[PDB]
C-alpha cells in the first residue's frame, strides 16, 4: 500500500532555469531540486557544475507554487541537489526529516510533472540501488517518502533513468544511491 500523499502534495513546486523545468520540494523557506536544472541540453553531456553555478544569479531561477511565483533570494549546491532560498516560508510544511534508506526497504513515490502531483505508488530499493519506478520526461525532483505517525521521512529525490528502464536518484542531502553520476553518459545497473 502507498502512504496517503496529502502532506507531500503541499510541498511540491515547479523550478525553471532557462528552458529546463523540473520539480522541487519546498520546506520552510528552502526549495530542494536536482542540480541538473542549471544545465542546457548540451551541458548535460559533460557538466562542469561548479562553473555553471557561478554563471547563474538568483533571478535566473523561476520557482512557482501553482500560479504564485516565489522570489529566489539565495542559492547553493549540496552534492547533487540545489538549494534555493526563497522569501516565503511554506505554510503547509509538515513535520519532516531526511533519512537515507537501505536496499530492501520500501517507500512511497509521489510522481509529479510541472510541479503538479500526478500519482502515488510504492517502490522498493533493489540491491544495486535502483528502483523500478514509473517516471517520464519532467519527473525529476519527484520525491520518495514514508510516514511515521505525523512525521514525513523524505528518502529519495528522482534524477535519472537507466538503459534497462530502472531509475536512480539521491537522498535529500544530494548523495546518490549507488555508483551513479548526474551526467548523460554511459551508465548501467
Ligand atoms: C528528469 N526530469 C529526467 C527523468 C528521466 C526521463 C526519462 N525517464 C526518467 O526518469 N532525467 C534526466 O533527463 C536525466 C538527466 C540528464 C539525462 N537523464 C537521463 O535520465 C538519461 N539517462 C542517462 O543518461 C543514463 F542512462 F545514463 F542514466 C535519459 C537518456 C534522458 C533517460 C541527466 C543530467 C542524467
Numbering used by the authors: 6 to 194
Task: Quote the study's own text.
In Severe Acute Respiratory Syndrome CoronaVirus 2 (SARS-CoV-2) and its closely related SARS-CoV, a single copy of the main protease (MPro, nsp5) encoded within the polyprotein (pp) 1a and 1ab mediates its self-cleavage (autoprocessing) at its termini (nsp4/nsp5 and nsp5/nsp6) and other cleavages between nsp6 and nsp16. The fully active mature MPro is a homodimer, with one active site per monomer, and exhibits a monomer-dimer dissociation constant (Kdimer) in the low micromolar range. The active site consists of a Cys145-His41 catalytic dyad. Domains I (residues 8–101) and II (residues 102–184) exhibit a chymotrypsin-like fold, and domain III (residues 201–306), comprises a cluster of five alpha-helices connected to domain II by a long loop (residues 185–200).
To find out whether inhibitor binding to the truncated enzyme can restore the geometry of the oxyanion loop and the overall configuration of the active site to their native states, we obtained room-temperature X-ray crystal structures of MPro1–196 in complex with covalent inhibitors GC373 and NMV at 1.80 and 1.85 Å resolutions, respectively. MPro1–196-GC373 and MPro1–196-NMV complexes crystallize in the isomorphic monoclinic unit cells with a P21 space group. Superimposition of the independent molecules in MPro1–196-GC373 (and in MPro1–196-NMV) with a monomer from the mature MProWT dimer39 clearly shows that the native dimer is not formed by the juxtaposition of the two independent molecules in these crystal structures. Thus, in agreement with our solution measurements, GC373 and NMV can covalently bind to the monomeric MPro1–196. Moreover, due to inhibitor presence, the C-termini in the MPro1–196-inhibitor complexes are better defined in the electron density maps, so we were able to model up to Gly195 (molecule B) in MPro1–196-GC373 and up to Thr196 (molecule B) in MPro1–196-NMV, the entire length of the construct at the C-terminus. Another salient feature is residues 189–194 belonging to the S5 loop which become ordered in the inhibitor complexes even though both inhibitors lack P5 groups. A close inspection of the oxyanion loops in the MPro1–196-GC373 and MPro1–196-NMV complexes reveals that residues 139–142 adopt the native conformation in both structures. Thus, covalent inhibitor binding reverts the oxyanion loop geometry to its active configuration. Similar to GC373, NMV interacts identically with the MPro1–196 active site as it does with the native protein in the MProWT-NMV complex. Direct hydrogen bond distances differ by only 0.1–0.2 Å in the two structures.
